[PDB]
């Protein structure tokens, strides 16, 4: 079988990036540049596109990886510019379907460095349409402008064959992505989402993540309900015996 692939990553109105699309590689994509180039920003934007759960997203420095820094800030807000921003993934499914998943990010006005995230998906987009252009409107002389979610919905609905969906919960977002062969595990419960984010977070910083090795049992071995049922049966028996004894 032909495994699906991540074609490209698009960044809109990000810190440093206005509208930039990196075409990913079949095997390895490398990013270089002096300190502060913005590679970590690209990684963060990708992972935000993958797991938009705001509770999990925490972009600590590679130094103090997992060491509590008490900054009170997850670091995502400072990585976005004012206004609308987008982070999208084009994926070729094993069914050879081009699906553009993505999220609209937006800073929340106020002293708190808080952000709002709204996921979305597009199916059936023609292979000739690039997300960078799809998400921007050419206004002025070579001066494209970004358009909000409502405008994007209007633009896409006017097209033929493209199906756009907007999710009210990251749960359905993950469910749809899993349905299209994008995620290995079905993140039905919040614990599954936490484990998934733990895996990608350990990968990003690389190496032996303390939490992983500490819960390797939970991460590898599957949960069994028969043992739980048997223990509950024994619990009920013991409770009845105690009732009788008392």
């Amino acid at each position: 079988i032909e495994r699906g692939k991540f074609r490209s990553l698009t960044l809109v109105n990000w810190n440093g990036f206005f509208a930039r699309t990196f075409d990913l590689d079949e095997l390895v994509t490398t990013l270089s540049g002096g300190n502060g180039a913005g590679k970590s920003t690209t990684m963060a934007a990708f992972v935000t596109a993958l797991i938009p759960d705001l509770t999990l997203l925490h972009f600590r420095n590679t130094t103090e990886a997992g060491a509590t820094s008490g900054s009170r800030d997850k670091g995502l807000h400072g990585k976005l510019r004012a206004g609308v921003c987008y982070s999208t993934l084009d994926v070729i499914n094993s069914r050879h379907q081009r699906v553009v998943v993505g999220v609209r990010l937006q800073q929340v006005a106020g002293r708190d460095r808080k952000v709002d995230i709204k996921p979305f998906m597009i199916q059936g987009l023609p292979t000739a349409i690039q997300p960078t252009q799809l998400l921007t409107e050419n206004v002025g002389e070579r001066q494209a402008r970004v358009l909000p979610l409502n405008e994007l919905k209007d633009r896409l609905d006017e097209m033929e064959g493209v199906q756009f969906k907007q999710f009210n919960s990251i749960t359905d977002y993950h469910a749809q992505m899993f349905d299209l062969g994008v995620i290995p595990k079905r993140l039905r419960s919040a614990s599954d989402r936490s484990k998934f984010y733990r895996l990608i977070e350990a990968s990003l910083y690389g190496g032996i993540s303390s939490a992983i090795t500490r819960s390797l049992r939970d991460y590898l071995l599957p949960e069994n309900s028969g043992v739980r049922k048997a223990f509950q049966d024994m619990e009920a028996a013991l409770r009845e015996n105690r009732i009788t004894l008392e």
Partner: protein, 233 residues
């Protein structure tokens, strides 16, 4: 009921041991520093095997502990685990939580990561006794095995026609040398794993695609300029 419990735990443990032992042969002697191979050690814990035996055959002998109004079932299990096998010397953790932990079958197996460091055989992998590159390689091996296991488990729910996408990251790749990066590349391609790596210097000039980013201050704001790179010219 206690006998039936112990039996089902034993069967589940045996099945999981067999599955993991079969999976172990999915590794092909990765070369990272002095680490020559990575392996998963699964073993039923004798401290817990004794507990299973007591539950399955000698439940009544310790009823005095079970039927105490002071102890809940989790606390009763914890106290019983304390009674027999008293040399483990658990820490300051409370009886309630340790009992609750005892109620999960997975706990009964020691599940550890072994590495064939140099010529010392297979040794337990402790971050405190491994170089940075060795630990990074071992962690990547663990993560790839975990994602493989997740894919395998979901093979039933998913349709027969879809293979989920595979992708991982590695920031500050400069911590790895050429040999380690070549080994990582060969592993990822053998496992059809996509990788996104970062390093200040182009550490992988002759494989995959590469980009270089330069940040320019420009009219009191910033812009990132991206340039593709090619192996030869």
């Amino acid at each position: 009921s206690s006998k039936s419990v112990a039996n089902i735990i034993r069967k589940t443990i045996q099945r999981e041991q067999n599955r993991i032992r079969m999976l172990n042969q999915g590794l092909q002697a990765v070369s990272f520093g002095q680490v020559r191979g990575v392996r998963l050690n699964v073993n039923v814990r004798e401290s817990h095997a004794i507990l299973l035996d007591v539950l399955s055959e000698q439940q009544e002998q310790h009823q005095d502990l079970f039927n105490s109004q002071r102890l809940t079932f989790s606390e009763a299990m914890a106290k019983l685990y304390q009674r027999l096998n008293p040399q483990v010397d658990m820490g300051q953790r409370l009886p309630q939580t340790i009992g609750e932990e005892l109620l999960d079958y997975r706990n009964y197996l020691e599940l550890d990561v072994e590495v064939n460091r140099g010529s010392d055989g297979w040794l337990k992998a402790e971050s405190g006794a491994l170089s940075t590159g060795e630990a990074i390689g071992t962690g990547m091996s663990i993560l790839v095995m975990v994602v493989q296991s997740w894919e395998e488990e979901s093979r039933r729910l998913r349709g027969k026609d879809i293979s989920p996408c595979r992708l991982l990251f590695l920031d500050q790749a400069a911590r790895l040398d050429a040999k380690s990066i070549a080994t990582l590349f060969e592993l990822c391609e053998r496992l059809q794993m996509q990788l996104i790596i970062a390093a200040p210097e182009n550490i992988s000039p002759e494989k995959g695609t590469t980009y270089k980013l330069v940040r320019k201050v420009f009219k009191n704001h910033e812009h990132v300029h991206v340039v593709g790179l090619r192996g030869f010219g």
